[PDB]
Paper text:
The first procapsid form, prohead I, is built from 775 copies of the head protein pb8 arranged into 11 pentamers and 120 hexamers, as well as a dodecamer of the portal protein pb7 located at the 12th vertex. The DNA-filled capsid is decorated with 120 copies of the 17.3 kDa protein pb10, which binds as a monomer to the centre of each hexamer. Basic principles of T5 capsid assembly and maturation have been established and follow the phage HK97 paradigm. Here we investigate the properties of pb10, the decoration protein of bacteriophage T5 capsid.
To explore the nature of the interaction between pb10 and the major capsid protein pb8, we first searched for the position of pb10 on capsid structures determined by cryo-electron microscopy and image reconstruction. Two density regions corresponding to a single hexamer of the empty expanded capsid observed without and with pb10 were obtained (estimated resolution of 8 and 9 Å, respectively). Pb8 adopts the major capsid protein fold first observed in the X-ray structure of the phage HK97 capsid, and its 3D structure was modelled on this basis. Six copies of this pb8 model were fit into the density of one hexamer in both cryoEM maps and the density corresponding to pb10 was identified. We did not observe any additional density inside the capsid in the map of the pb10-bound capsid, showing that pb10 is located at the outer surface of the capsid. The density corresponding to pb10 observed at the centre of each pb8 hexamer has a size compatible with the NTD of pb10. It appears as an averaged low-resolution lump, likely due to the superposition of one pb10 monomer in each of 6 quasi-equivalent positions on the hexamer. The CTD density is not distinguishable from the noise, suggesting that its position relative to the capsid is variable. The centre of the hexamers is formed by six copies of the A-loop of pb8 (named by homology with the equivalent loop in the HK97 capsid protein) and its surface is negatively charged due to the presence of multiple aspartate and glutamate residues in these loops. No shift of the non-expanded procapsid band was observed in the presence of pb10. This shows that the structural reorganization of the capsid protein subunits that takes place upon expansion creates the binding sites for the decoration protein, as observed in other phages.
Numbering used by the authors:
A (entry chain E), B (entry chain D), C (entry chain C), D (entry chain B), E (entry chain A), F (entry chain F): 164 to 455
The structure:
């Protein structure tokens, strides 16, 4: 009846009262370590490691230098945990905040913190270490630690299940355990439709329940971390396996705090979120990936 | 003997009493949602889910002027919920009813309703949205979502079970689950008997029981909703896979009511049966279809 | 020494006493439904299942005249179940019975009833249905219903077991159930020795018994009704699979009776045997056979 | 020194105290039926099982002339079961008995009876039926039954278990059972270690014991009567599978008796053992054998 | 520096002490039977099995002259068991015993007895039957009894498990059981590694226990008696399988006694170790070996 | 702004700190026997195992003179248990020690003893035994005993699992058992995925635990002493399997001790570690390795 430019504009318009989030993916992997508070400029350590060496000496007296005899070493290595600053800044103007909707500022604050955390997780996963923490698929990669798939447990010809097993027993050479798997979402999809020598398929069987879905999706009974924080290289899959109780800790030189001023050349409200963070490192075989 | 046009018409004949219904098929799929009453003629549901986010900042001073900018945000996105009208009339006259049958109308009101129910399902199940409730295949198919089978879960070649698993995983990256499957009766026939890995049939073993068939007809323990409200593309399949308790609601802006009049030019009996409906939508990857 | 033409005929020979039947099997399959007595020359009855229908109408008015709404019809259809006559007749002479024996007749009456009973089953199983009851391999097949195997649930390669399952599914599409299965004795002896991937055979486990044999030979746990009244073709196997207690009734307008006269020009005994029976039909998927 | 014809004959010489018998197999097959006591020369039985069947009549009339009228029959067939003579005799003289052992005669009398018994079994197992009982195999094989393996359940290729099955389902179709099986030792000695699809053998499983053996040495749980009294052929193996409690009876006009006379020239001693026996023949297909 | 002829010889140096006996293996295989004491140089006995027979007689008289006269016979046959001699000696001297080890004789006497016991086992395992017992493989192989595996239970292509399987059948044809099997060390190692249709070896599974090693090394749940006293034929392998509790007794006309003399015209110490043994032979199908 | 060579090295530095050992493995394979302390220069002792054996005697008198003479012996043969010397010294001075760390000697001394323990285990594992003790592998392989696989109880074909079983039997044909297996890590990776009849592997199953891993890595349920002190021969594996408590003893004529002097021309800190050891041998078949 009424058209626009009659009286259409005078009727009820509902707005989204209660909204959903931007970003609904959990933040783990980058923080999946002991989170240790720190305040120091640097932290420096040393290890024993050893002395002497000893051999086989024919004896028959007390004190013998007749044959073989004195043997010593001292050794090394000092190591320094090098700390980084990671931080963010954001604007809002009174100009934007004042219309008739003043509910924006409360909402905004809880996006900022959530957003600083995202950038940390991505920085820990992929990051070169300049201006950012020590990577996880940089220190376990082919790029700067030279770790690919295990070829000391490959005769010729591999398969996708096999690769996980092969990397797992590379960790037990390094003497450590496995306690979580971090896998690409595609990989886990493939392993959900598991191929087994049970021949029932533990994604389903005949009688299906939450027990089965939650068993197939765990490999070796362990939390698979489904994550999307991986480049796709080619048809290759990247994996990160290591222990997560005997591995690395996140020393945080400043725990996340939100800092705030009004000043940016007028007033205006300016927001600072600031953390300072790193990864520990002791070994380059101390975390293991492999390229399919 | 007794021949017709002689004396055959003065003896016995039987007539029916009680009568089979038209369509003994259960109406579901289009009525497989929660039914929410609405009194509001439009809903303008502005979503509101975020303010600020994060940044990477060096900090260590009260006011920092050297690092990155700050962030301040509004929020988005208004959603207009628009209802449509579905309804029909039936014109009848006493003049046709006049013979010796007068029990026609007590069945007929409930034939018209049952029939009006069919078209409600067909429109709910498949539909553009223009003058009809939002369509279920359509909203989740290539037509207006570009949602087909997940190509990031397949190398090439997809067997019938294997498809379902690609769609199952697609669902959980959304944040939603699966609790029933809607399949075509001809597709449903290769799941009624399926050739399976236990190598005995888990439809029937050697010693069929209603239990084994009731387990197999639940793909993943989840009921398959056998329906015949599906287009036919080719030897390609169609699926409707979603959760049916967390997805979309069916909002009914006028529930079905029967108005009755007797005015059409004389008397005459006039019936008007009228409803108003739509379906909710937030996302169109919140529902899943796919292409075999 | 003693031989024919001495005195051998005057001495000892022990001549016949007692007889064993003709056919030491049960007569099955025609009689496998309810058998209801009637007294009504024709069961004319009208079956009316639907009235109304309704549609989607956009309204915004009480009396909605703006678009058509009006939906109403009567329905159809009338059917007539017409009884047929089956009969058997015999005329003998006193001369044939007599030589010193006159006990033939009380036994003659049984054989007549029994042989009649056989024809009835012949007529129910295969029969054009005009003057006699309609078939069950002549009704239910390609001959007069277009009902064979279900090709739309085949993959490719029909094998015998597969054929029964596809056919089973063809029944549940129709809405009717299965409660007995009717099969060919030649096929039966190979449902008795069914292949199963249980892999020890459940008809000779290695802890062998009559139980396993009486299980395997009951396809789906429902009794196999061994029957052999089937036509020939090549080596196609036909089956009769239907619900046998929620379908057709056999209606009896005349119960078995023997009407006995002597007078036939001479005496003579004249024996007339009469029954009036039919088969019902409701739909052209009301019963299912399939061709292999 | 010491040689024969010195002092070696008065030295100890040990002679046999006890002996084995020639034959240590239990008799079986031909004394495995009912042993019916009898005293008549012949049993002449006439079986009369069926009289009357009538016809399906066309009705509204009693003493039909629109079809063939009222049927009645008498019946056939007289059959005569005639005993045959089995007699065996032996004779000794006082010259035969005397050596230095007088104690042979109670043993000889046992031996003759046993020896005669073998001849009864030999004839009952295979026998023309002319001055001996009819042979069980001589009426079950190709010899005059003309009953071999059913073509009607071979797609091509027969194996030993299938041949037994083929033979078994002939039985259930002549109205009889299987209650024992008679087989050939060489074939029985292949179910000693029985190949099967467990592949771990269901003859011995994992932990061989006597129980498993005496159960697997049966086919259908029913005792395999391990014998070697069948004739040689080639690589063909004939069996007998029939009921052994609803089958052919032995009518014994004389139960086995021991007769002793002395007289025949001088005295001297004579041992005669005589029985008069036959095997029934109710049907020529009332026993089933077959050619492998 | 110091060596023989300087000062090396004056330091304590450790010379021999503490003995170990010749052969660390149990004397069995010829000693597996009952050792029955006897005192009779030769044992002469008949074994009586049966006397007369009694052939079928037609009868209907009390002296049957119409048939062949009575059967009768004595009993055969006479058997001689002849003892053989086995002994060993040592002639040592007073000069030998004098001049290093005077405690040699208490050990030397034990070795003479023990060494004789092995030589006895050599005579029982394979024996000429001339001056020494009758052999054990000798009476059971082709050497003097023409017993190889039964070619009339061959299904073509004899394999290891099967040879035993045929051999067991040959046993039941004698009517004697199988209770242990005596094999060659090298075969026994392959039989320990039995491959069965579990396809995993029941030798050690994957879940080993002493029971499974103690189970594999039993064939048919009967223990194998592992031995080395066998000849190596060719590529053919000797097996010896019989009952070992209802077969051959070893009759001993003298038990092992140690006899001691000193004279030979001088003294000198003379040690004589003596036994007298024979081995029963009833049949040559009373012990069964074979050729591979 | 700041850089090194400005003030940075003096600004608040975390110097090196703490420690972790080298040889992050337990000493195995050398320590795997009874360790007997000894205090004797040599033990020179006679193997004592037989004294006479005699032979058979036909008798006929208390003595004989007809047959062979008598046996009686002392005993053969002397063996000498000889020690070797293993040892080394190490040189350090006060000049080296004076920097700013004086916790070096308390660590250097532990390392030295540990470093000596390694050169002992090395020599114990492989060695010529000439001035060191015997090589465990060397004596056992084909280098010095001519012992490879048991290829007189092997027919055709082998796998890794088989090669162990060939060795396993080879021990017991000297009466010896098994109580450990020694294996190369490269092989150990291949026993991780043990191929078995339960056909899921007992290393994962579907559900893993430390227990399954501890069953599959113990071949026969007995500890595999996993070690990496093995020579890498080629694509061949060596193994060492013998009994390790019913065989060889390791006799130690001097236990490990540390002697220390400070004088040799200057002072100077001098350490001497010295020990004396041998490994016994008794036969060349009393320790077994194998070439895969």
């Amino acid at each position: 009846s009424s058209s626009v430019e009659v009286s259409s504009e005078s009727y009820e318009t509902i707005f989204s009262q209660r909204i959903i989030r931007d970003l609904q993916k959990e933040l783990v992997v980058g923080a999946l370590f002991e989170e240790l508070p720190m305040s120091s400029k640097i932290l420096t350590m040393l290890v024993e490691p050893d002395a002497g060496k000893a051999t086989w000496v024919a004896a028959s007296t007390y004190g013998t230098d007749t044959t073989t005899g004195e043997e010593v070493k001292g050794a090394l290595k000092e190591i320094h945990f090098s700390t980084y600053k990671l931080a963010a800044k954001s604007f809002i103007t009174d100009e934007t905040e004042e219309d008739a909707i003043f509910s924006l500022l409360p909402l905004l604050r809880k996006r900022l913190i959530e957003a600083h955390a995202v950038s940390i997780e991505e920085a820990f996963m992929t990051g070169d270490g300049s201006g950012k923490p020590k990577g996880l698929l940089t220190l376990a990669s082919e790029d700067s630690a030279k770790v690919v798939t295990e070829a000391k447990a490959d005769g010729s010809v591999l398969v996708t299940a096999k690769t996980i097993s092969k990397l797992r027993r590379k960790l037990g050479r390094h003497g450590l355990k496995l306690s979580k798997l971090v896998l690409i979402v595609s990989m886990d999809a493939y392993y959900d439709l598991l191929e087994d020598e049970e021949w029932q398929d533990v994604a389903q069987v005949g009688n299906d329940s939450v027990k089965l879905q939650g068993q197939v999706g765990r490999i070796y009974g362990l939390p698979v971390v489904v994550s999307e924080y991986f480049p796709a290289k080619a048809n290759s899959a990247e994996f990160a396996v290591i222990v997560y109780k005997d591995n690395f800790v996140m020393p945080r030189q400043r725990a996340v705090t939100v800092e705030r001023e009004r000043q940016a050349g007028k007033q205006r409200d300016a927001y600072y979120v600031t953390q300072r963070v790193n990864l520990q490192r002791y070994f380059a075989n101390g975390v293991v990936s492999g390229t399919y």
